[PDB]
Amino acid sequence: VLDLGALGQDFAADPYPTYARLRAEGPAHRVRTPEGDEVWLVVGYDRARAVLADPRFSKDWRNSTTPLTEAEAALNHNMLESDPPRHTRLRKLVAREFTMRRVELLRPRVQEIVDGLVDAMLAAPDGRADLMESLAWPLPITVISELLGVPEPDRAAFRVWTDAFVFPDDPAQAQTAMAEMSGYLSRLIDSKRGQDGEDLLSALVRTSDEDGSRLTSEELLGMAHILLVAGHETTVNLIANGMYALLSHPDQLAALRADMTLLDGAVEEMLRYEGPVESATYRFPVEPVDLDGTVIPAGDTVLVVLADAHRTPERFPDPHRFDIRRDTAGHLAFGHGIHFCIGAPLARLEARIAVRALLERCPDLALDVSPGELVWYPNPMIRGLKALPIR
Numbered sequence: 001v002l003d004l005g006a007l008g009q010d011f012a013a014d015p016y017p018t019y020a021r022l023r024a025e026g027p028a029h030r031v032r033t034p035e036g037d038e039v040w041l042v043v044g045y046d047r048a049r050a051v052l053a054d055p056r057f058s059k060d061w062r063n064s065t066t067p068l069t070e071a072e073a074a075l076n077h078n079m080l081e082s083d084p085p086r087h088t089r090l091r092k093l094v095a096r097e098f099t100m101r102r103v104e105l106l107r108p109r110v111q112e113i114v115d116g117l118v119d120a121m122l123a124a125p126d127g128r129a130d131l132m133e134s135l136a137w138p139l140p141i142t143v144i145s146e147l148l149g150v151p152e153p154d155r156a157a158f159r160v161w162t163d164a165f166v167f168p169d170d171p172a173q174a175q176t177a178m179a180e181m182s183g184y185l186s187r188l189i190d191s192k193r194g195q196d197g198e199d200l201l202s203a204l205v206r207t208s209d210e211d212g213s214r215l216t217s218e219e220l221l222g223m224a225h226i227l228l229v230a231g232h233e234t235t236v237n238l239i240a241n242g243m244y245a246l247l248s249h250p251d252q253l254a255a256l257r258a259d260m261t262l263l264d265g266a267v268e269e270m271l272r273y274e275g276p277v278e279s280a281t282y283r284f285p286v287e288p289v290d291l292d293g294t295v296i297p298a299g300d301t302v303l304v305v306l307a308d309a310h311r312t313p314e315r316f317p318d319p320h321r322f323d324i325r326r327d328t329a330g331h332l333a334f335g336h337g338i339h340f341c342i343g344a345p346l347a348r349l350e351a352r353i354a355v356r357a358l359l360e361r362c363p364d365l366a367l368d369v370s371p372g373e374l375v376w377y378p379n380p381m382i383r384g385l386k387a388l389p390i391r
């Protein structure tokens with residue numbers, strides 16, 4: 001047992017040793033998260049990678065001996081929290097809207113938002129600004145909002161809720177933020193029906209209305225929620241976490257500026273080295289699972305620590321080395337198996353474009369604060385900074 005909460009900001013800023021110390025003992029460990037959830041952690045690449053796809057580990061709450069709260073039960077009917085055949089049917093509804101080829105068509109607009117964002121930051125008569133506030137946050141929400149059909153003004157709200165799901169001002173703020181969001185979503189869905197809108201939310205509504213067995217109303221709400229939540233802090237932290245590593249490793253920042261053909265690889269290294277998903281979402285085994293002699297009971301919550309698999313020397317030689325030229329093949333930053341991130345092409349698209357943009361423009365690009373003054377979130381599921389001042 002370990003109370004990651006008790007560990008404090010020290011564990012949050014650098015949780016890797018802890019996960020590593022555990023990986024040296026066994027492949028699974030019962031811990032208590034900063035908020036207070038008692039779960040099992042799966043560490044070590046091979047085991048992490050295997051568990052992720054393993055059919056034995058279900059993502060359907062019906063298989064969790066720890067039941068959903070009321071607020072959460074309004075949102076669990078989504079592809080990420082289901083197993084086939086439901087997962088299969090639900091992902092097929094949006095699969096075509098997220099392929100590399102369809103996403104690429106968004107380049108002009110994505111490239112467009114970044115330029116504007118970067119032009120404003122540079123206007124800073126201080127040569128100093130927060131890259132989190134100026135680019136990392138604005139971009140993700142703007143892109144997804146236009147795609148689905150979430151009004152510009154309602155986007156702040158999501159910043160607040162998403163904040164609460166990761167770190168609530170109390171074990172209640174999370175549950176209340178879910179409720180508020182679940183109510184916003186439903187109302188927005190209502191406002192869309194019969195309006196002949198062309199945005200993706202409008203399409204999904206029509207589909208639900210065409211065949212409720214194809215997409216139930218509780219799945220229509222679940223779908224909307226998952227497409228807007230699953231990629232929010234994740235994409236935002238990929239960008240903040242990616243620029244930071246590069247900024248904290250000038251050797252690599254110089255490498256990319258000098259050779260832009262390293263872009264896609266450097267982003268892959270970012271995902272690897274400091275991806276925003278520290279631990280994958282809840283899995284619940286359908287039956288007892290002996291792992292190296294460690295048996296997790298059926299129905300227990302399990303978090304696969306992607307961060308620890310990404311620092312497993314065996315798989316990634318010299319894992320603590322941020323190297324934008326390293327063979328990343330195999331990283332699990334976007335997951336592994338049937339649940340592989342559907343938004344990966346778009347996320348990559350946004351990160352790749354914003355990264356280059358900054359490297360090109362920003363002449364004397366550098367961290368404008370001591371790493372020690374940086375603050376991270378305790379949550380073992382998401383790796384992200386509260387701020388990232390640059391100059």
Ligand code: HEM
Nearest residue numbers: 079080230231234235238280281334335339341342343347
């Ligand atoms: C840097 C950003 C991102 C990262 C690193 C990331 C990471 C992940 C991870 C690790 C999974 C699987 C989790 C598990 O198996 O427990 C996943 C699933 C998912 N992601 Fe992403 N994601 C990112 C961006 C996005 C974006 C931009 C969207 C939407 C456009 C998105 C939508 C989803 C959805 C719908 C799922 C569930 C897929 C399924 O259950 O089959 N993601 N993502």
Ligand SMILES: CC[C@H]1OC(=O)[C@H](C)[C@@H](O[C@H]2O[C@@H](C)C[C@@H](N(C)C)[C@@H]2O)[C@@H](C)C[C@H](C)C(=O)/C=C/[C@H]1C
Nearest residue numbers: 072075076165166178229230233277279281381382
């Ligand atoms: C896909 C990887 C990221 O996970 C998420 O976006 C998860 C799914 C999301 O989790 C929960 O959000 C609640 C509002 C509903 C709940 N479910 C019980 C209905 C759903 O599982 C994040 C909000 C959770 C964490 C805090 C996060 O910010 C992102 C984590 C990534 C691993």
